[PDB]
Design a protein around this ligand. Structure first.
Ligand SMILES: NC(=O)c1ccc[n+]([C@@H]2O[C@H](COP(=O)([O-])OP(=O)(O)OC[C@H]3O[C@@H](n4cnc5c(N)ncnc54)[C@H](OP(=O)(O)O)[C@@H]3O)[C@@H](O)[C@H]2O)c1
Ligand SMILES: NC(=O)c1ccc[n+]([C@@H]2O[C@H](COP(=O)([O-])OP(=O)(O)OC[C@H]3O[C@@H](n4cnc5c(N)ncnc54)[C@H](OP(=O)(O)O)[C@@H]3O)[C@@H](O)[C@H]2O)c1
Ligand SMILES: [Mg+2]
Ligand SMILES: [Mg+2]
Lengths: 657, 657
């Protein structure tokens, strides 16, 4: 079977992160069999030593000599640590000299929670491990590849990272999906800069068979575990959606509404004539859709769900004592029966298996073999190769640019609304949006949330008339956007429409260095992490907070490109646009599937090419009016027109101005 | 170099169309070296005999014996002929038994004209050779592959066939682009039906180095030839656009306007105070942008351009004597100078080369090698592999579904307009559109162009009130849509907005047969050709005619899918939607680049999945209103808002209802 492989990559040096097991371990193995000298990097020394010994033994069997010189290991390497990545590159260059192939394979599953239950630090950790690490290693190795006149960067993405003009929603995995999309977008935008010397591509396998305790989660894996979590999350979502909806139209505070749940009795809540209709209807559903042997059919929640529900409420700025659930009656085991858990387990498994046109799961070996043959192709760059595929799954096309205003019925919903606008750099866009909502569509007030005092003063001077009239309020957020939103909620009330623009402009630094330069001026590893903080994490933090705070709609706005933006700014803007589409699509589907009201969509001020941009003041006026129209199209709330069909249309989409 | 290849496909039987030269010849060569028995099909016997001898000689050199049994040829096989495809399959099965790999490689360049200069029979020929032939061979070979439990269909598409959610405009190549997109769409929609036994994928290489006299045109090729044609076409486009525009706002007939060109004197036309401003301004441009040594700077046209211009005018229903240009003064050679031709030649070459990130053209051998390694992958189906790529080129994202109505300024342009509606099956959509234009937006009249008398009577009964009032006229087109449009032009006047819906519904027949069946009920080769005639050729014929007839806008409407459409209807609808997007994007760019006024866009009534469809009368009412909004968004003309920026936005787009 190895006949076709031996000699294919003779003379090459390859660095494989996550190289002791899974797909990475097989790519390392097969590259070594093909003749490459390999460095395997991962955290655990023992697993690396086992893999190294297995590969060296196989190399000796096929005839290689001095096998200790062909397979090296780099233990204690966690790709989320910049210092560990710097050490890995020094160790690899010391062992083998210049790296020919950088195989950016290591990937972690991430937080595995809905955005509204996702810690911000958890999101950041996934980006550091899965995405920022890929830029970091490219930044350290590409100078030597360019100098020698050849190199290859391969980012191991996922089918769930999407494709060129479409996002793929991956509910409960937004951090992961964004990291995967970012890996592909990095190949797409850097290819022109890295060429002709260096190829950069991504692989996007679908689910791959492997160790049930490991992997990034595309494969079925652990069933009873995945199922029980799904059932616990479903109970949390149903309770949270009913309490949020009840609070919106009931005179009682969230504290008073949560007090209705304290007897923890489903039948008593359904039968309570004074309980809000959303809670009584929910209790009816728990009794009907429930297994009579499961205590979840007679009890509303348990201590674990209650704590996670309380965390959502506190994070949404609702006021409740921390000990509100201290005396909650504990429901008897089983909360969910074995039958319920096994039914959900079969649903998870069959769902994944049912996507496959070929009705067979590829192996890690199969995926690695297709990848190692693909590496021999010298005529591809900026591509995403699918070593496995043939999947039936939902897709969200991105980049539509032909649109108009929403219906007068949708625009009528804006009268007397509380609008939040977030931004700093885009003063023209912010001024025009505040004026459109206040002057044209009768919003009651606009809360302008900026980053700095200088930004606040600039907006206050631009909107002096609305400031004086008490229609425009300004808040300075700094790096504490969630606390700034809590200030807005307490002082000015909860938002209806929200528009989120980035605080910062894109940097103007080179993306590659000259062949004989030290690359000292090129976008640094720290600067790439800052780009992700300002252009991706910013939107995630706002979306998480606004959804938790019962915002009606949210428009995520990407950076602006113009006819005079630098070529590097166009590349970075397109990297952000593609990567954020993964977030928008995923959170849109999460929201829709969990009966959350919020409509979340993306409005792009970034275009693929300079030639598409306005060239004169007339075309610029047309562009700014298109921006206002795009934002109103995604922020005007659906009138009580609110169907399942209309609901799916108005969430997780991206439109280009 | 062959070490990695020998044995990879041992025991396989492969059929390669266009197998005597180019990419196909190399795929045949490398599959044979890898151990497959190959059948090479093409038209010329001599080139097939040369290729067969070269491959057999190379097989003997590497150690194969009885090489005459491993490489067979099938001369006189033109893939555009159904009878020749039937003979090819009988010859291959007689030689080798069951085919394992069907390599649908043969492709012709096609007409190589703008849509408005493209003969309808030429378009049909390209579809037969490049697309219908692929279905035909799959239909003949898949029953035996399913029976044996394995098979592979590979369609050789092009980067210019587009990708999953994006079309790629290919001006002057619409027939070719549609055929290439259709090959990819066939892999995308048939994969679920052909699985698990059969894999179906496409390859989409970018430009490939080859014989300058051959190939499908992605590579630079012949320069002085490509350039002189571009210059001749540019003169034709500029003259045609100026005459069409002048005729629209001048009291003189097209005959009288063309008489201004008969002295064939640029300076005299510019200096004529009675000549329309569009013609005087054009003559000024010919004098300024022209080479003084070129007779095209002092003469408007030559006999060749004049005949092609007269053909456009006659095909647009303008009345002119066939001998109008019989006495045209012949301009002295050179009409275009060597300097002008060489400048354009360098532009063509540099344009193609400048797209490549790797600044190197892949060879046929390189592309075939990557393809033969890819064929070993058993875990992919419905995919498009790019064996070469890394290209900078324009892309048109498709499938946007969040939109609203156009501006009141655009809708005001519809008052007193002449609307043409084309269709038959979609009576509800046709009735609602005629009523929207007449009752809501004050169109003067609607011309309803149907296929049959029964269709006409159905529409006349649905629209009885507008029929009686003389606001709704009905014409029966049959299979003569162009003559039907000429009747509408003569009797009712030239159209402003035009909506083109398919006359026919999609068929309800199986797309695959049972393993042990004869497949007698499965979609036949003739039925697949009929599907292309009714769902692709229909729109091309209407777009070609309407653009030539000075229509203001055109909406191409795809088939309707509902919550109750069969699974085969969903597959066929999606095949059409993807394939027609290639046409819409290409003609939109052709029109924009040649200063044609017409706005051409696509409105899709097809969705990817059943779960997205309306489920009740309320959601169905929402869907039909969305259809009207989509059509008005693409058909309301741009008010004298008509800029270069707005122009590019409003052409070649596709929106999903
Ligand atoms: N599994 C799938 O079905 C699938 C599908 C599509 C794409 N992918 C992608 O394929 C890649 C590999 O996935 P996998 O399923 O093989 O993963 P895996 O089974 O979890 O891990 C394989 C290797 O990664 C190492 N690793 C884990 N976390 C690490 C970290 N923080 N830093 C460094 N090394 C780390 C492990 O060693 P240590 O634990 O000792 O560090 C081991 O060597 C990922 O990028 C993933 O997104 C996977
Ligand atoms: N050339 C490129 O840069 C490029 C790029 C992307 C995709 N492609 C695709 O690659 C495929 C092969 O293209 P190519 O450039 O190799 O083409 P090519 O050079 O024109 O032709 C190669 C072979 O096709 C045969 N052939 C031509 N017309 C035929 C017909 N009507 N019926 C049967 N055989 C026919 C030729 O033999 P006879 O003339 O004797 O029949 C010869 O064997 C096509 O599908 C094309 O669309 C090409
Ligand atoms: Mg711009
Ligand atoms: Mg429908």
């Amino acid at each position: 079977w190895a006949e076709s492989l031996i000699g294919l990559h003779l003379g090459k040096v390859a660095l494989i992160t996550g190289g002791s097991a899974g797909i990475g371990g097989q790519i390392g193995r097969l590259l070594a069999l093909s003749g490459a000298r390999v460095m395997l990097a991962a955290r655990d020394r023992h697993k690396l030593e086992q893999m190294q010994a297995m590969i060296q033994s196989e190399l000796a069997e096929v005839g290689y000599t001095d096998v200790e010189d062909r397979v090296h290991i780099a233990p204690g390497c966690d790709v989320s640590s910049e210092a560990q990545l710097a050490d890995l590159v020094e160790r690899t260059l010391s062992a083998f000299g210049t790296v020919d192939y950088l195989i950016n394979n290591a990937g972690i599953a991430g937080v595995e929670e809905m955005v509204i239950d996702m810690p911000v630090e958890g999101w950041r950790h996934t980006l550091f491990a899965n995405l920022i690490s890929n830029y970091s290693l490219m930044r350290k190795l590409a100078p030597l590849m360019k100098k020698q006149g050849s190199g290859y960067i391969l980012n191991v993405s996922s089918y769930f990272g999407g494709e060129k003009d479409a996002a793929i929603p991956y509910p409960n995995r937004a951090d992961y999906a964004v990291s995967k999309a970012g890996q592909r977008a990095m190949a797409e935008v850097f290819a022109r800069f890295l060429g002709p010397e260096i190829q950069i591509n991504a692989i996007a396998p679908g689910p791959v068979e492997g160790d049930r305790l490991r992997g990034t989660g595309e494969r079925p894996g652990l069933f009873a575990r995945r199922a029980r979590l799904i059932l616990e999350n479903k109970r949390l979502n149903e309770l949270h959606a009913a309490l949020i909806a009840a609070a919106r139209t009931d005179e009682r505070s969230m504290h008073e509404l949560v007090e209705l749940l304290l007897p923890n009795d489903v039948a008593a809540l359904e039968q309570n004539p004074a309980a809000p209709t959303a809670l009584r209807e929910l209790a009816r559903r728990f009794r009907s859709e429930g297994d009579p042997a499961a205590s979840s059919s007679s009890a509303l929640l348990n201590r674990s769900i209650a704590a996670k529900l309380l965390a959502r409420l506190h994070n949404g700025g609702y006021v409740l004592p921390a000990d509100i659930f201290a005396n909650l009656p504990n429901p008897p085991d089983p909360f969910f029966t074995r039958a319920q858990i096994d039914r959900e387990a079969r649903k998870v498994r069959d769902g994944i298996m049912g996507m496959l046109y070929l009705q067979r799961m590829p192996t890690e070996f199969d995926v690695a073999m297709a990848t190692v043959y693909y590496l021999a192709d010298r005529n591809v760059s900026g591509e995403t190769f699918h070593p496995s595929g043939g999947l039936r799954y939902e897709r969200t096309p991105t980049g539509g640019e032909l649109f108009g205003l929403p219906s007068p019925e949708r625009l009528a919903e804006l009268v007397g609304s509380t609008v939040y606008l977030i931004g700093e750099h885009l003063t023209e866009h912010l001024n025009l949006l505040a004026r459109a909502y206040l002057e044209r569509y009768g919003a009651r007030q606009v809360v302008m949330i900026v980053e700095t005092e200088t930004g606040a003063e600039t907006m206050r001077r631009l909107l002096h008339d609305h400031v004086e009239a008490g229609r425009l309020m300004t808040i300075v957020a700094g790096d504490q956007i969630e606390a700034a939103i809590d200030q807005a909620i307490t002082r000015y009330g909860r938002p209806g429409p929200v528009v989120c623009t980035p605080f910062r402009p894109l940097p103007t630094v080179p993306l590659v260095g000259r062949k004989d330069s030290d690359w000292s001026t090129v976008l640094s590893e720290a600067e790439f992490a800052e780009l992700c903080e300002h252009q991706l994490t910013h939107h995630f933090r706002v979306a998480r907070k606004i959804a938790l705070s019962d915002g009606a709609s949210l428009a995520l706005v990407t950076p602006e490109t113009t006819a005079t933006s630098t070529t590097e700014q166009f590349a970075l803007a397109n990297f952000i646009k593609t990567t954020l589409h993964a977030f928008t699509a995923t959170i849109g589907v999460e929201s829709e599937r969990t009966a959350q009201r919020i409509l979340i969509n993306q409005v792009d001020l970034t275009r693929r090419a300079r030639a598409e941009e306005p060239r004169d003041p007339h075309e610029r006026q047309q562009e700014l009016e298109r921006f206002i129209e795009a934002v109103l199209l995604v922020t005007a709330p659906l009138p009580p027109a609110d169907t399942r069909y209309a609901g799916r249309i108005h969430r997780g989409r991206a439109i280009t101005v």
